[PDB]
Design a protein around this nucleic acid. Structure first.
Ligand code: FES
Ligand code: FES
Lengths: 159, 159
DNA sequence: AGATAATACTCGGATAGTCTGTGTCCGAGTCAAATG
DNA sequence: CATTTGACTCGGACACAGACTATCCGAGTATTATCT
């Protein structure tokens, strides 16, 4: 099972695409009724991964670092939910009475290999789609004036 | 992160191929030095999915009910860790001041879409592989006499 | 007008509460045997 | 050969943990209003 908060961060990435100004955490927190503190924690988890930049001062907030096309889903999932792979091999082939010697274990145990390859196919099929593809499909479906309209609501009265 | 106990159950899928007689959890527990109780819990979790049969009595144990070829890795992982998906959409687009109305909510959020497509590819890479590929690769690499040999060790003194 | 110091707003990590695993346990049920 | 015992099996119920969730107050900077 994976973290729920990832959606919170990802639904912030999508809205920030249409935001030309710096936006403070608390604003987004109210933008979808979430613990302002814990969204701010998620933003810290993104600032650590150098995905977003955190400007200080009166006109402070969070801003996208690189263009929307170059940010893949994989980068987000790896940054937030935890970079560690999902399945881990406890190496039980080297435990018990019939422990395979260190001479016949030149290859990885086919179970581990298959599961790893599956996880790789997961994260690859995830990485193929970017945030730009999503913003293009949302301005295709939910109208091209909705997302700029939200981007305009976020910047209402900064100082 | 995924449940550790998944590996414990999946390494047993191979041994049942070589077990002609009923084999109880405790024997497998020593077969890879693991919690006899906690492996047994995972075995019960798998028995509930109706993959293997658990027979009680003196010469009782766990046996494969249906052929090894029709049991994919997908069936095992979903049985043990839980069939519920890892990622969960709480529908945050209908909460807060800028809640997407219940009229623009005909289709599933494109984020869910991408995450689905990724997990689907994951589960597809799980379903493609069977137990026949596992027993074939272990008889290909660690010799075709290893699997019958361990299957025979399991049956050493079933009284 | 320009320099300066008060100011007000915002990141950042350090801090408690709660929730699904993780490990363990003993009882109900069952078959095989030992026995008259 | 029927029966009693016996001991061995799984099944679900019981504590412990690391981790996710939610939250606080301290560090840093552009606004800004004043003072010369
Ligand atoms: S030793 Fe862990 S997958 Fe085989
Ligand atoms: S509202 Fe949940 S994935 Fe977009």
């Amino acid at each position: 099972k994976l973290s729920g908060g990832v959606e919170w961060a990802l639904h912030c990435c999508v809205v920030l695409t249409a935001a030309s100004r710096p936006v403070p955490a608390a604003r987004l927190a109210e933008l979808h009724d979430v613990s302002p503190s814990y969204l701010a924690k998620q933003m810290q988890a993104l600032s650590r991964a150098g995905l977003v930049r955190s400007v200080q001062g009166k006109t402070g907030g969070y801003v996208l670092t690189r263009p929307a096309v170059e940010i893949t889903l994989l980068d987000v999932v790896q940054a937030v939910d935890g970079p560690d792979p999902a399945f881990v091999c406890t190496e039980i082939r080297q435990r018990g009475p019939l422990a395979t010697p260190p001479e016949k274990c030149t290859k990885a145990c086919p179970i581990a290999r298959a599961m790893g390859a599956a996880e790789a196919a997961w994260r690859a099929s995830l990485a193929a789609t970017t945030i730009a593809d999503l913003v293009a499909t949302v301005d295709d479906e939910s109208g091209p004036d909705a997302l700029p309209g939200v981007g305009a609501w976020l910047i209402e009265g900064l100082g």
